[PDB]
Amino acid sequence: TLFVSYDQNGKKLSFANWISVLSSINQTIFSWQT
């Protein structure tokens, strides 16, 4: 009796990651001549 079946809303969804973006030598010392 009294079947409405309009309030399931079992979405159970997760996050979507809608973040925003704002984007060889060998030795340790190197020298040059001038």
Binding site: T1, L2, V4, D7, G10, S14
Partner: protein
């Protein structure tokens, strides 16, 4: 001699009787409370004039998942794999012991699990505010009626479901002895069957600690003289019971499990219980030579008034 002897008690019937289901979050939730009451009379006088209905929608229930480490430390030949398998069996035994305990999920969040606004703001920067995730146990989800801080109270019966009056958690009352023997009455499990039938659980399994099987064994006999065995030239002395049928026509299969608390008995059911897992057992090591295991697991129960529990003690 080139072998070792290990007892390895590994019954684990519950884990294989409840299956498992993967999730994608450390906190899962379902929603189911009941159907609407009967209300008795529903006569009318050719007019509705309702009050926006008495739907009173379902309640949202959740549970938490915990962590098990069981570290391995090496300082038989290759003892590594041996100790690893031994610790695996030990963690499985510990899981079988915990999931049937009377623990109650305890965490900073109670019903506002989301709190995405706050969500423990004082966590980042110091990372040392670590709390301890504790999951919900069997006796906690079976329509309990209290809890002694973190353990379910073993002397208080549960409430009644509004759909149909049923008390799925009751304090046993052995009306046979004058409160001296700690044992099920002859008609204390049938009361549970009646309550379940009224609530409509359809359970057909009963786990029991071997410290109580003697009760069902002797139940096949009595002293008044109305129940007695017979042996018509039979070379057997079968002393065991593995099936019950209440007057309502509900069959019940009995199984024994040594990992249950002695002062309790459980009424399980396959589908009504499911084992939620997030992190599978992984053999690995900490940050930048030890080995370790880490298993994230949680407990889920379809509906509290489906399964049944019964505590064994004397009233006082």
């Amino acid at each position: 001699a080139n072998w070792i002897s290990v007892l390895s008690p590994q019954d684990t019937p519950f884990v294989s009787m409840t299956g498992k289901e993967s999730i994608n979050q450390t906190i899962f939730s379902w929603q189911t409370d009941a159907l609407a009451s009967v209300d008795g009379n529903n006569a009318h006088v050719e007019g509705s004039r309702a009050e926006d209905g008495e739907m009173k929608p379902t309640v949202i229930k959740s549970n938490v998942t915990q962590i098990l480490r069981k570290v391995v430390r090496v300082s038989r030949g290759r003892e590594l794999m041996y100790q690893l398998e031994k610790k695996g069996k030990e963690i499985k035994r510990d899981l079988e012991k915990i999931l049937l305990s009377g623990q109650a999920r305890t965490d900073v969040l109670a019903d506002q699990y989301l709190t995405n606004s706050a969500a423990d703001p004082a966590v980042a920067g110091l990372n040392d505010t670590h709390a301890a995730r504790k999951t919900g146990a069997f006796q906690f989800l079976c329509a309990h009626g209290g809890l002694a801080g973190g353990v379910v109270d073993k002397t208080k019966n549960g409430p009644a479901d509004p759909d149909t009056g049923a008390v799925t958690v009751k304090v046993a009352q052995n009306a046979s002895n004058p409160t001296t023997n700690i044992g099920f009455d002859e008609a204390d499990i049938f009361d549970m069957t009646l309550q379940l039938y009224t609530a409509g659980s359809e359970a057909d399994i009963i786990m029991i600690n071997p410290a109580h099987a003697k009760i069902f064994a002797g139940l096949q006999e009595n002293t008044q003289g109305s129940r007695k065995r017979i042996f018509e030239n039979t070379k057997q002395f079968i002393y065991e019971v593995n099936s019950i049928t209440d007057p309502l026509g509900q069959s019940y299969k009995i199984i024994v499990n040594r990992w249950m608390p002695t002062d309790a008995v459980y009424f399980f059911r396959s589908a009504d219980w499911t084992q939620m897992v997030l992190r599978a057992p992984k053999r690995t090591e900490l940050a930048k030579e030890k080995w370790m295991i880490e298993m994230e697991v949680g407990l889920r129960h379809r509906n509290p008034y489906a399964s049944g529990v019964l505590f064994t003690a004397a009233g006082k």
